[PDB]
Amino acid sequence: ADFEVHMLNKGKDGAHVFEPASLKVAPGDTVTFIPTDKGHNVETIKGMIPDGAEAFKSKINENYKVTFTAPGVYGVKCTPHYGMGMVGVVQVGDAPANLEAVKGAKNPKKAQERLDAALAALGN
Ligand SMILES: [Cu+2]
């Protein structure tokens, strides 16, 4: 199954957002990060990806389709807007095994707030 995340300068959750900011998928599903507004990208957050996964980083303004295979939670950021909290979580499967490992990852405050909110939205 294929899902979409819009990369936006603003949205319901404020400035510099992924919409949705949380998504539950199954192994092998894809998510396309869409440059609805210019100036964004998507990148894995260090320490917030599960065993079996590989880091990625899209180009600014790239329409970017990612396949998520290994189970667990994946924290993602927009490289330029990470400091302002432009982040999201994609969770592959239920009962993510890496939940405590990713909760320990260091993030600037606005990113941490939104990551914790996304984790809670996903049932964690
Ligand atoms: Cu951005």
UniProtKB/Swiss-Prot annotation:
Cu cation binds at H40, C78, H81, M86. Its main location: periplasm. Its cofactor is Cu cation. Binds 1 copper ion per subunit. Residues 5-93 form the Plastocyanin-like domain. One of its GO terms (cellular component) is periplasmic space. It is found in: Periplasm. One of its GO terms (molecular function) is copper ion binding. Keywords: Copper, Electron transport, Metal-binding, Periplasm, Signal, Transport. This soluble electron transfer copper protein is required for the inactivation of copper-containing nitrite reductase in the presence of oxygen. This is Pseudoazurin. It comes from Achromobacter cycloclastes. The gene is bcp. The chain holds residues 29 to 152 of 152 of the full protein.
